[PDB]
Design a protein around this ligand. Structure first.
Ligand SMILES: Nc1ncnc2c1ncn2[C@@H]1O[C@H](COP(=O)(O)OP(=O)(O)OP(=O)(O)O)[C@@H](O)[C@H]1O
Ligand SMILES: [Mn+2]
Ligand SMILES: [Mn+2]
Length: 281
């Protein structure tokens, strides 16, 4: 499969990395077309522990299977090819040439209300289609939303995703602590807690919507545990110079993702019916 991979593609420059991966631009030899390959080291560079190797191999098998499930959506990355050797996995994808939403937010500082509107509608439609399949992404954040050549977003990174059976609940904690829903944190501090569902994605959506308009996240503290209490209490504001220029309509939408009790939180469908997206009914 390594021969298979290097037999069919010429590897190019690094585009990004993760704890146990490297993503590169690569050229398909037969077509001369360009792709992005995510290279996952299941061994972890000679340092994990046999058990973990099989936790990482079944992790990426879960990832590939979630990707085959969501294929075809216009705003979701397309897995085009996969190769598997004893240590490495190779996921071949369409090449997103305008990088991350993160990188784009870094250079613009903040995004206007109309640009945020366009991005958020595209993401909510994505999330809506995931949730109908009962898929929870669990890593929604600006680094995992990419931009193609016309600046339309492409949801990517399904490495923590899962399909749920009817009424099932999750318990493991994964994802970036600034984007983590409260019920996840709660769950990590109580064995008796019910577990969390699809709604964690609607919290993250809230932190992303907020952050594109403010240029900074709604819940931060240099000391993690105090940041987590802020999140668990849902203690944030539309403040200082930061929110002065925006409508009341956007802020109302945001505050409806940013609700602690999951039951009371907006769903992807509720968010698309808000007045904020109804200008042209
Ligand atoms: N299809 C792609 N087109 C262009 N660049 C990409 C593509 N896929 C990934 N990259 C880049 O590589 C980075 C890492 O990709 P990905 O999120 O899929 O890796 P990961 O190891 O799962 O990351 P994480 O630490 O968030 O778990 C992305 O955030 C992006 O910069
Ligand atoms: Mn990622
Ligand atoms: Mn990931």
């Amino acid at each position: 499969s390594t021969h298979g991979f290097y037999e069919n593609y010429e590897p190019k420059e690094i585009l990004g990395r993760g704890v146990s991966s490297v993503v590169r631009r690569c050229i398909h030899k037969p077509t001369c077309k360009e792709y992005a390959v995510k290279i996952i080291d299941v061994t972890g560079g000679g340092s994990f522990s046999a058990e973990e190797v099989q936790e990482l191999r079944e992790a990426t098998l879960k990832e590939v299977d979630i990707l085959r499930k969501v294929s075809g959506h216009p705003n979701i990355i397309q897995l085009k090819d996969t190769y598997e050797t004893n240590t490495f996995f190779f996921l071949v994808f369409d090449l997103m040439k305008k990088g991350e939403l993160f990188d784009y937010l870094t250079e613009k500082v903040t995004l206007s209300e109309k640009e945020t509107r366009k991005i958020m509608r595209a993401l909510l439609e994505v999330i809506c289609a995931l949730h109908k399949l009962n898929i929870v992404h669990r890593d929604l954040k600006p680094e995992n939303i990419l931009l193609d050549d016309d600046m339309n977003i492409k949801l990517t990174d399904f490495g923590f995703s899962c399909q749920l059976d009817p009424g099932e609940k999750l318990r493991s904690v994964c994802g970036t602590p600034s984007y983590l829903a409260p019920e996840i944190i709660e769950c990590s501090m109580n064995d008796n807690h019910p577990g969390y569902g699809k709604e964690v994605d609607m919290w993250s959506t809230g932190v992303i919507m907020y952050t594109l308009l403010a240029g900074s996240p709604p819940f931060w503290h240099r000391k993690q545990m105090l940041m987590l209490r802020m999140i668990m209490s849902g203690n944030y504001q539309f403040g200082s110079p930061e929110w002065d220029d925006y409508s009341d309509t956007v802020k109302d939408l945001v505050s409806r993702f940013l609700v602690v009790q999951p039951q009371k939180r907006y769903t992807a469908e509720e968010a698309l019916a808000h007045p904020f997206f109804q200008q042209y009914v």
